[PDB]
Amino acid sequence: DPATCEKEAQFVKQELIGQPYTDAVANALQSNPIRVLHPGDMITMEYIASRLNIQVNENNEIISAHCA
Amino acid sequence: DPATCEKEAQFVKQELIGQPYTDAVANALQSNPIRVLHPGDMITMEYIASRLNIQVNENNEIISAHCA
């Protein structure tokens, strides 16, 4: 659901920056699906408005989120 | 800078969805850098808070935007 994903991306970007992406975090998220993006991942550009992307750095710290 | 990026990504998500990404639209954006994401593009993920991504469909119609 694009509506929930956008809300959740906003929340991640506001409240979770710098924290480890954990099973607690994934379970607190109602978006589906969820994809974790890492530095150097090579992916094909698709567009799933309901998909929450959580961007992390090399140490699994959350740095951003967006829906696609 | 990230401030202008997030503002413009918001303007785009809010006002330009479905519109062709024309030179007139592109030239009006002040973000730097700006990257256009086309369907099926293979992208190596590296997060850059200042970069405005304009995602278009196969007809160059805007479907989304995010900073990364």
Swiss-Prot record, chains A, B:
Describe the thermal dependence of activity.
Stable to heat treatment. Retains 33% of activity when heated to 100 degrees Celsius for 10 minutes at pH 7.5.
**Keyword tags:** Disulfide bond, Protease inhibitor, Secreted, Serine protease inhibitor, Signal
Q: Which domain of life is it from?
A: Eukaryota
* Compartments reported by the entry: Secreted
Q: What is its main location?
A: secreted
Cellular component terms (Gene Ontology): extracellular region
Task: Name which cysteines form disulfide bonds.
Answer: C5-C67
Q: Which GO terms describe its molecular function?
A: enzyme inhibitor activity; serine-type endopeptidase inhibitor activity
Function, as annotated, reads:
Elastase inhibitor. Non-competitive inhibitor of A.fumigatus elastase with a Ki of 1.6 nM. Inhibits the fibrinogenase and collagenase activities of A.fumigatus elastase. Inhibitor of A.flavus elastase and human leukocyte elastase, and weakly inhibits porcine pancreatic elastase. Does not inhibit elastase from P.aeruginosa or C.atrox venom.
Descriptive protein name? Elastase inhibitor AFUEI
**Organism expressing this protein natively:** Aspergillus fumigatus (strain ATCC MYA-4609 / CBS 101355 / FGSC A1100 / Af293)
| Lineage summary | Eukaryota, Fungi, Dikarya, Ascomycota, Pezizomycotina
